[PDB]
């Protein structure tokens, strides 16, 4: 479900050495982290101009002609807990994001989080470190729909 839907939607970024980040196409816009550096693949989508939102640590831009079948709509509605994810499952207890310790790391900055219906709910940019449940510094959308930046203490961006 999650692996099939994230296929041909999570576009890897290469720093000419390795994959070092993911850029996501949601809501008719491309967005990638600022702190990742390199060249996005999919040279059709590599040629678009991206403008910087340094507040949310992102570069975002208008996607090319592929309007249909590449929407991947986002959801401001956030029921707590039990969300699927690329590397596994995340949790939304107490307004934060928790993962089992050891997942993620450098080169995985930008993968999205999907709901049970497959709609994207969150795009991470870094992570904190609690002893058991690792936290995630993330760009989400508020209950009014405006985008917000949820960052816990000591969020290593990698």
């Amino acid at each position: 479900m999650c692996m099939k839907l994230e296929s041909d939607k999570t576009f890897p970024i290469m720093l000419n050495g390795q994959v070092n980040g993911y850029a996501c196409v949601v809501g008719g816009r491309l967005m990638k982290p600022l702190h990742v550096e390199g060249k996005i693949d999919n040279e059709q989508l590599a040629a678009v101009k991206l403008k910087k939102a340094s507040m949310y640590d992102l570069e975002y831009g208008d996607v090319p002609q592929n309007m249909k079948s590449d929407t991947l709509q986002y959801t401001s509605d956030k029921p707590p807990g039990f969300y699927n994810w690329h590397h596994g499952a995340v949790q939304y207890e107490n307004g934060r994001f928790t993962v089992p310790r050891g997942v993620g790391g450098k080169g995985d900055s930008g993968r999205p989080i999907l709901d049970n219906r497959g709609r994207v709910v969150a795009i991470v940019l870094g992570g904190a470190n609690e002893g058991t449940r690792t936290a995630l510094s993330v760009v989400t959308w508020n209950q009014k729909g405006v985008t917000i930046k949820d960052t816990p203490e000591g969020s290593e961006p990698w």
């Binding site: 809501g27 008719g28 816009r29 967005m31 939102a53 507040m55 949310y56 992102l58 975002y60 709509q73 986002y74 401001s76 760009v139 959308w141 009014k144 729909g145 405006v146 985008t147």
Partner: peptide, 14 residues
């Protein structure tokens, strides 16, 4: 710039 970036990243928001 800093008042439209909260709303440029979210098209479905009002």
């Amino acid at each position: 710039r800093d008042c439209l970036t909260p709303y440029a990243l979210a098209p479905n928001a009002t």
